[PDB]
C-alpha cells in the first residue's frame, strides 16, 4: 500500500524514477539532513532550496504507507520547480528516467553550490572512477586520475558464445580497458606499451546502475536492446575497487525501473520494496511491489529478477543477515 502517482500524458518517466528514489532510505535521510543542514554564526543567510524540499515532500510520502485509502498523489508540483532550473524538455528522447535522474542530481548540486558559507553534505549517489596505467616491461604505474559519476551507465555487450548476460559482465565490460601501443616509459628511460586500468575509487552508499537499453541505431532511429541481463538481490563490488585490501563492499537491491514496449506503446514502470515503517521503521522489507503510475500491486522477488532492468537502485549494506 504505497501511494500511486497520477500520470496523464507525458509524465510516467518521472513517476517511475520517483518510486525508485523513494525506495532508497539513505537518499531520504540525506534530504531530511540536507534540507535541515545549516551552519551557525555565518552572517549571510542561506539561499532557499525549492527542489530539495519539493523532492523530499514527495519521496517522504511515497516512503511511508498510504494515509488515505488507495490515494494517488500529483507530482506536477515537482515539474514546475525543475523548470526554475535550466531544464526545458525539448525532445521525445529526453522523456527518460536516467536523463531525469541526471537532471535532478545536477539541480541538487546547484543547490549545494548555492549556499556556500554553510556546509551542505554531498549526495549519497556520488562516487568516483579512477584511471591508471602500468607498464609491462618494468611493472610500475602512473599516478592516478580521478573522475565522478552519479550512475554506472553500462553499455550492453554483444553476444559471443550465447551464454546468459550477467550484470557482472556488463560491469566488467565497463570497468576495464585495453593497452596503448606507442608512448614512452619513465623507468624504461626511452616506443613502449602499457595497460590501461580503470577501476572505481569511491563507492556511493546509493549505487545507481544503468543499462543502456535505449540508444540510436546506425541511421538515427530509436534502437532498443531487448536481451535480458541477470542480476541478484545482493551484489558485491569488491572486484571493481581500487584499494587492494580485504575490506568488503556489499549492496542490496531497493528498486528496479523497467521500460516496457516502445514508441506508441512505450512505458516506464517500477519494482520496489514495500515501506519499512510497519511499526518497525528500521526493518527494510522483503515484500516487493509493482507500481505503474496510479497502479500498485504486490510482486514476488522472482517477478523482479525476471524483469528487464533499466535502472537498478542498489544500496550498501554491511552483512547479509536478513
Amino acid at each position: 500500500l504505497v501511494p500511486g502517482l497520477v500520470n496523464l500524458g507525458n509524465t510516467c518517466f518521472m513517476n517511475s524514477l520517483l518510486q525508485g528514489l523513494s525506495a532508497c532510505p539513505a537518499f531520504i535521510r540525506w534530504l531530511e539532513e540536507f534540507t535541515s543542514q545549516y551552519s551557525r554564526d555565518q552572517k549571510e543567510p542561506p539561499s532557499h532550496q525549492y527542489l530539495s524540499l519539493t523532492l523530499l515532500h514527495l519521496l517522504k510520502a511515497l516512503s511511508c504507507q498510504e494515509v488515505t485509502d488507495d490515494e494517488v498523489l500529483d507530482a506536477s508540483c515537482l515539474l514546475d520547480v525543475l523548470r526554475m532550473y535550466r531544464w526545458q524538455i525539448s525532445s521525445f528522447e529526453e522523456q527518460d528516467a536516467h536523463e531525469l535522474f541526471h537532471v535532478i542530481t545536477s539541480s541538487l548540486e546547484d543547490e549545494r553550490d548555492g549556499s556556500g558559507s554553510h556546509w551542505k553534505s554531498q549526495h549519497p549517489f556520488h562516487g568516483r572512477l579512477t584511471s591508471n596505467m602500468v607498464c609491462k616491461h618494468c611493472e610500475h604505474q602512473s599516478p592516478v586520475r580521478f573522475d565522478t559519476f552519479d550512475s554506472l551507465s553500462l553499455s550492453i555487450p554483444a553476444a559471443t558464445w550465447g551464454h546468459p548476460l550477467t550484470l557482472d559482465h556488463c560491469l566488467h565490460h565497463f570497468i576495464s580497458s585495453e593497452s596503448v601501443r606507442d608512448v614512452v616509459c619513465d623507468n624504461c628511460t626511452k616506443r613502449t606499451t602499457f595497460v590501461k586500468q580503470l577501476k572505481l575509487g569511491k563507492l556511493p552508499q546509493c549505487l545507481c546502475i544503468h543499462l543502456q537499453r535505449l540508444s540510436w541505431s546506425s541511421h538515427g532511429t530509436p534502437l532498443k536492446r531487448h536481451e535480458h541481463v541477470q542480476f541478484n538481490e545482493d551484489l558485491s563490488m569488491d572486484e571493481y575497487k581500487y584499494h587492494s585490501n580485504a575490506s568488503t563492499y556489499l549492496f542490496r537491491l531497493m528498486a528496479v525501473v523497467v521500460h516496457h514496449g516502445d514508441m506508441h506503446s512505450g512505458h516506464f514502470v517500477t519494482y520496489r520494496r514495500s515501506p519499512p515503517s510497519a511499526r518497525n521503521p528500521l526493518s527494510t522489507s522483503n515484500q516487493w511491489l509493482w507500481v505503474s503510475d496510479d497502479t500498485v500491486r504486490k510482486a514476488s522477488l522472482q517477478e523482479v529478477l525476471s524483469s528487464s532492468a533499466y535502472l537498478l537502485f542498489y544500496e550498501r549494506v554491511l552483512e547479509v543477515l536478513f
Epitope: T160, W161, P164, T166, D168, H169, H172, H173
Partner: antibody, heavy 116, light 108 residues
Framework: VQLQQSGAELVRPGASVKLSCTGS????????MHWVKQRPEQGLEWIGR????????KYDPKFQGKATMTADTSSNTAYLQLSSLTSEDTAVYYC??????????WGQGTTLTVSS | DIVMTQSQKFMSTSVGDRVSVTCKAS??????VAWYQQKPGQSPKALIY???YRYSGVPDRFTGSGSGTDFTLTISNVQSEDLAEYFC?????????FGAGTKLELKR
C-alpha cells in the same frame, strides 16, 4: 531434445567434405550455433559461429581460408564445409547450440579421419 | 588471440574430497569464463556460464570463482560421478578459445 549430427567419413588428403546437424526442437535460426574441433593432443578449438537467421558468419582467422559455413531453416540442416585436408586435419567435430536454463546443447560427435 | 593456461593435464583426488582446477588467461577477460565437463566417449557438458553461475542440473558441489585473469573451478565432496575432463572457455573476445583439458582421478 537431441541435436543429431552426420555420421563420420574418411577421405584422402587434398579433398573436401561437408557435415550436417539437425535437432528435435526448433528455434534453429532463433539461436546462435557453433562448430568446434577436438583432437586429443592440441585439444578443443573454436572455428566459427553461424547466424542462421541470415548467413554472414564469423570465422576464426586461422580457419577462414579453409572452413566455410551455411544452413537451412525449414529443413533444420546446419552445415560445415572444410577443404584441402591434411592428415593433420583429423579431429572430432561438434556442433553446439546455446541455451539459457539448461546447459547448452551438444551433438553426438563426428569423427573425420584423413589418410593416404 | 587469447589462451588459458590450465594447471595440469591430470589431478588426483579422494572421494568426498575438495579439488580446485584453475585457469590463467593472457589478458583481462572480465567475468567471461565458462567451465565444461567431458567424460570419455561423450560430448561436452556446460557447468558454469559466467565465472560463478551454475546451469540447471549442476550440483552445489561445483562452484566457480575468479575475475579478470585468474579463475578456479572447485568441487566439494567429490562424488564418483565427477571423474571427467574439465575445460575452461573464454567468450570475452573473438576468437573463442579453450584450455587443454584436465582429467581427475582417485588417488591410491
Amino acid at each position: 531434445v537431441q541435436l543429431q549430427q552426420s555420421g563420420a567419413e574418411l577421405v584422402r588428403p587434398g579433398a573436401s567434405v561437408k557435415l550436417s546437424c539437425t535437432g528435435s526442437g526448433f528455434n534453429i535460426k532463433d539461436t546462435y550455433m557453433h562448430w568446434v574441433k577436438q583432437r586429443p593432443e592440441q585439444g578443443l578449438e573454436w572455428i566459427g559461429r553461424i547466424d542462421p537467421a541470415n548467413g554472414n558468419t564469423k570465422y576464426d582467422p586461422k580457419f577462414q581460408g579453409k572452413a566455410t559455413m551455411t544452413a537451412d531453416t525449414s529443413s533444420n540442416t546446419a552445415y560445415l564445409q572444410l577443404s584441402s585436408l591434411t592428415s593433420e586435419d583429423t579431429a572430432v567435430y561438434y556442433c553446439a547450440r546455446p541455451d539459457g536454463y539448461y546447459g547448452d546443447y551438444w551433438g553426438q560427435g563426428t569423427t573425420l579421419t584423413v589418410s593416404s | 588471440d587469447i589462451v588459458m593456461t590450465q594447471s595440469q593435464k591430470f589431478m588426483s583426488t579422494s572421494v568426498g574430497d575438495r579439488v580446485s582446477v584453475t585457469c590463467k588467461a593472457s589478458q583481462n577477460v572480465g567475468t567471461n569464463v565458462a567451465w565444461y565437463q567431458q567424460k570419455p566417449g561423450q560430448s561436452p557438458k556446460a557447468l558454469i556460464y559466467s565465472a560463478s553461475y551454475r546451469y540447471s542440473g549442476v550440483p552445489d558441489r561445483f562452484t566457480g570463482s575468479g575475475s579478470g585473469t585468474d579463475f578456479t573451478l572447485t568441487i566439494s565432496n567429490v562424488q564418483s560421478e565427477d571423474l571427467a575432463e574439465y575445460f575452461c572457455q573464454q567468450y570475452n573476445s573473438f576468437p573463442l578459445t579453450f584450455g587443454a583439458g584436465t582429467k581427475l582421478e582417485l588417488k591410491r
